[PDB]
Design a protein around this ligand. Structure first.
Ligand code: HEM
Ligand SMILES: *[C@@H]1O[C@H](CO)[C@@H](O[C@@H]2O[C@H](CO)[C@@H](O)[C@H](O)[C@H]2NC(C)=O)[C@H](O)[C@H]1NC(C)=O
Ligand SMILES: [C-]#N
Ligand SMILES: [Ca+2]
Ligand SMILES: [Ca+2]
Length: 336
């Protein structure tokens, strides 16, 4: 049966090359299978590559973007000049070299490096991995990536055009559970967006709902809001989507179960991975993706804050009963 050169069993012979790029990425790109900045930069890249897809531009007779086509690498010279693509150059060049060296398409490589990077982070689901996306791409049109200063209406229209419902936009944002910022407020470089930047969990949904109390840095950066405790950064779009009536009930439902969040995120990522492609024309190589270590911690409201400190915004559903922690308010270290 298809046994690959290294002796692993896979579904199709097209999956065998991916065991070599697995080894390369884990040893080199990810510095020994770690869940640090390279994983977080690849999650920004997979989103920025895939979202350059617009049915509305196509309808108006313009090129609407090829979706998850690897154009952010093949055409980095034009796409990294876009406002939302700062701080990605070094990661793009590292991925370029792996793609050229292994002979795999850039669009497939980005989806693969996302599933492999997430497997290094405790609590992650096993993402689907399909191979076969053409290596040819045209540059993404500008203005298709949502920005942190955009209103909720602007973000939902952009994401809706690409094909996501308001619920799926909230589901996709679970990736901010493994996040920090570097370019919005450089004075507090790598300030985390939740208290566990290395654990794929529910904390990001809980903590964005908390009352904004603290200014973490010397001044406020672009699209920065007050956060709940020292060291945590809060961006305006996340604060607004947590409280807006169109997204608030889904945001609240994401707070108490890591299992539900992981399933919803996996489904939304599988949809995003094939924007611009027919998934029935691709080959499934999901069995090449390893399991992540399980997260055994329960959701908690950190540092002595209680349910009275969260700004409940879903008028129909009572806030879930989440555990509290007896403690002084945390001060977060920079994400690694
Ligand atoms: C509603 C749209 C979203 C907006 C407006 C948004 C905006 C941003 C911004 C401004 C940053 C900080 C980047 C920096 O200064 O270094 C950030 C970080 C991040 N975002 Fe998003 N994001 C959104 C959705 C997503 C999605 C859907 C994903 C991917 C599945 C994603 C993954 C990440 C990750 C992992 C980071 C952390 C990067 C790092 O630590 O270096 N974001 N996002
Ligand atoms: C995918 O297409 C890109 C071109 O867009 C190819 O990238 C070039 O590859 C050659 C050698 O193979 C390098 O010297 C160039 O510097 C690369 N250019 C860019 C923009 O990266 C790539 O080889 C193609 N990959 C496959 C498997 O066909
Ligand atoms: C996130 N961009
Ligand atoms: Ca693209
Ligand atoms: Ca987290």
């Amino acid at each position: 049966s298809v046994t690959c050169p290294g002796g692993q069993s896979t579904s199709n012979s097209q999956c065998c090359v991916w065991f070599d790029v697995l080894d390369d990425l884990q040893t080199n790109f990810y510095q020994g299978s770690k869940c640090e900045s390279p994983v977080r930069k690849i999650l920004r890249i997979v989103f920025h590559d895939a979202i350059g897809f617009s049915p509305a531009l196509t309808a108006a007779g313009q090129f609407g973007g090829g979706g998850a086509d690897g154009s952010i690498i093949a055409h980095s010279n034009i796409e990294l000049a876009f406002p939302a693509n700062g701080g990605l150059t070094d990661t793009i060049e590292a991925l370029r070299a792996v793609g050229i060296n292994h002979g795999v398409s850039f669009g497939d490589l980005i989806q693969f490096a996302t599933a492999v990077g997430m497997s290094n982070c405790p609590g992650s689901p096993r993402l689907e991995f399909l191979t076969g996306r053409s290596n040819s791409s045209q540059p993404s049109p500008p203005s298709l990536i949502p920005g942190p200063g955009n209103t909720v209406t602007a973000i939902l229209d952009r994401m809706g055009d690409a094909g996501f419902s308001p619920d799926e936009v909230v589901d996709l944002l679970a990736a901010h559970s493994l996040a920090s910022q570097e370019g919005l407020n450089s004075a507090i470089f790598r300030s985390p967006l939740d208290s566990t930047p290395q654990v794929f969990d529910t904390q990001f949904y809980i903590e964005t709902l908390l009352k904004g109390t603290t200014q973490p840095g010397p001044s406020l950066g672009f699209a920065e809001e007050l956060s709940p405790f020292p060291g945590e950064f809060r961006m305006r779009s996340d604060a607004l989507l947590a409280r807006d009536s169109r997204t608030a009930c889904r945001w609240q439902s994401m707070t108490s179960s890591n299992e539900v969040m992981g399933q919803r995120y996996r489904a939304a990522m599988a949809k995003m991975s094939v924007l611009g492609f027919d998934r029935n024309a691709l080959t499934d190589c999901s069995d090449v993706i390893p399991s992540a270590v399980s997260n055994n911690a329960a959701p908690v409201i950190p540092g002595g804050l209680t349910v009275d400190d969260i700004e409940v915004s879903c008028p129909s559903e009572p806030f879930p009963e989440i555990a509290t922690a007896s403690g002084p308010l945390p001060s977060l270290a920079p994400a690694p």
